[PDB]
């Protein structure tokens, strides 16, 4: 009838090798880009001569703005994220005043710009990017990985001209009052659907294909309001240009019921896709 | 067999009283506030003594920014609701370079404000609130009103500390590319939910009854990752202060399936709610 066990009852305080990274590793190049913390540059490692990307961020502008444990949770993330259409890193270091990132280096820079200088794509290109996102949504599902919207400015261009899904826009929507508000009021009906299965990537999938061909989204309208109305009851129409096959793509990715937009396998399987893209 | 009808067969072009207000009809006293686009003023209808507040926007800053069609929205919807709980809207005017919007005036700041100096609200101060936002929405709903989250920062206080939902923030994810990211790349069934049944609605408002009673949020955390697990799978604790009457509403309002939530007569129902509501 004794309650003195053989067991633990004391409070527990749950609140507690090889060459390293060095900035001298690196010849610095020209400035590649910035965002609101980060600074990208071209970088090559001295040993090697290889060719990346380095990025430094300041650590008194980080946690000036609370946004220190969001960056360190995107760095453990996409560091173990390895596709390749998903934009590497390759690793991380930091010293007194600054956090870098060795990053793979994009030589054609993203597919808004791009898209800005042809204002549309065709077929080919189109179909070709399409098999790599989905290539890489297949990773991303099997990884469990929370992530956005995939849209062309989160896209960067590989040397050969292959899709690269940058991690743009972390520090958006990150809990620091933030700028453009948190989740903390949306239930999980709202937010569940990315990541559980495919049908909502598969949707915005469809949105990218149209915005490819097309050159705008298509159910942009002037208000909030309107564009709300557009989605939800799938009010779009497609320019005459756009061929048959992939008015039946886009068609069937953009279907309201989720349960009918095909999987990712479907997509690739697509005579539509099969017969324009190179991948 | 004739196809020549007496019908018109034309192409169309679809691309096509009283006093009204001026600003001598006002006078001016302090700034009550300013926004990216607005600026509040303390204002005085001269011909009845009555104190509203005047809210000037500049028509060159709307169209370099291209978010005049949604302001315009904006006018158009909030001054068609008339509920004692939603800041109402008596009407606009517009000159050479500006827009002029005439507001009830509302005394006692915001409830975002208030909760910063108080720290926590009490029972009585909560569930007084709730009755009133839960009025509000039901009129919402009613009117098939799309809105927001009901933040703090959305809600003024009257003169007599009454609720006043208010529409900041329009500007922020409206379609311009836009700072905050917008809708275009959302499926159905993740913008949906609002505005269909009052379920959303009744998730966020439980997030307000524990951020009201307990002073922060129930699902706050370091990243937008653990925030979405947290919400997703209901990973929330309750202060030793909060009492069983308190606990048993939010708990209900908090439910992961959506079915399960109480409706908004019976939120006005619940046994804590009648014991510590004055309205
Ligand atoms: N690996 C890369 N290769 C080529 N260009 C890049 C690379 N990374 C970034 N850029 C460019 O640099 C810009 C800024 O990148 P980045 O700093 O990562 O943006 P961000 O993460 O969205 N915001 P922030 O982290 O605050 O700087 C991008 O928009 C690209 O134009
Ligand atoms: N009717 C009002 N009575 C009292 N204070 C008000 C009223 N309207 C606005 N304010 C105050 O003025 C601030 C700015 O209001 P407002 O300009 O409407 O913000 P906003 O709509 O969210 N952004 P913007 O429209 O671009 O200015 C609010 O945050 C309040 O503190
Ligand atoms: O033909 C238009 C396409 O040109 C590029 O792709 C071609 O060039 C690459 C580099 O040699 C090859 O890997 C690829 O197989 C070629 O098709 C571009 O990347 C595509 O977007 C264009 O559709
Ligand atoms: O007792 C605390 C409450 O004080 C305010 O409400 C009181 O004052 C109002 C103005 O006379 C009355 O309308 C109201 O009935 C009173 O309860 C305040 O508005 C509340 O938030 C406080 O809970």
Redesign the interface.
Same mark, same amino acid.
């Given at each position: 009838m004794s309650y003195s066990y053989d067991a633990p009852s004391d409070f527990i305080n749950f609140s507690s090798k090889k060459r390293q990274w060095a900035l001298e590793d690196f010849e610095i190049g020209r400035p590649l880009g910035k965002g609101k913390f980060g600074n990208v540059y071209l970088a090559r490692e001295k040993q090697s001569k290889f060719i990346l990307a380095l990025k430094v961020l300041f650590k008194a502008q980080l946690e000036k703005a609370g946004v220190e444990?969001?960056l360190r949770?995107e760095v453990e993330?996409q560091s173990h994220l390895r596709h390749p259409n998903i934009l590497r890193l390759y690793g991380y270091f930091h010293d007194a005043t600054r956090v870098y990132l060795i990053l793979e280096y994009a030589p054609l820079g993203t597919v808004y710009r791009e898209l800005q200088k042809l204002s549309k794509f065709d077929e080919q290109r189109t179909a070709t990017y399409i098999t790599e996102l989905a290539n890489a949504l297949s990773y991303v599902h099997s990884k469990r990985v929370?992530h956005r *919207?995939?849209?062309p400015?989160n896209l960067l261009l590989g040397s050969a001209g292959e899709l690269k899904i940058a991690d743009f826009?972390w520090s =958006?929507?990150?809990?620091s009052?933030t700028?453009?508000?948190?989740? *903390?009021?949306?239930?999980?009906?709202?937010?569940?659907?990315?990541?559980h299965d495919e049908?909502?990537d598969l949707?915005?999938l469809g =949105?990218?294909v149209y915005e490819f061909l097309v050159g705008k989204?298509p159910?942009?309208?002037?208000?909030?309001?309107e564009?709300?109305k557009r989605?939800?009851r799938?009010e779009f129409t497609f320019p005459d240009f756009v061929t048959e096959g992939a008015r039946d793509l886009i068609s069937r990715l953009l279907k309201?019921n989720?349960s009918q937009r095909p999987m990712l396998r479907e997509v690739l399987e697509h005579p539509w896709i099969t017969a324009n893209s190179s991948k």
């Open positions: 444990h969001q949770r993330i929370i *919207d995939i849209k400015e826009g =958006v929507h990150a809990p009052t700028l453009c508000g948190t989740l *903390d009021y949306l239930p999980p009906e709202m937010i569940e659907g990315r990541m049908k909502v949707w915005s =949105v990218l989204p159910f942009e309208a002037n208000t909030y309001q564009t709300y989605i939800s799938v309201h989720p």
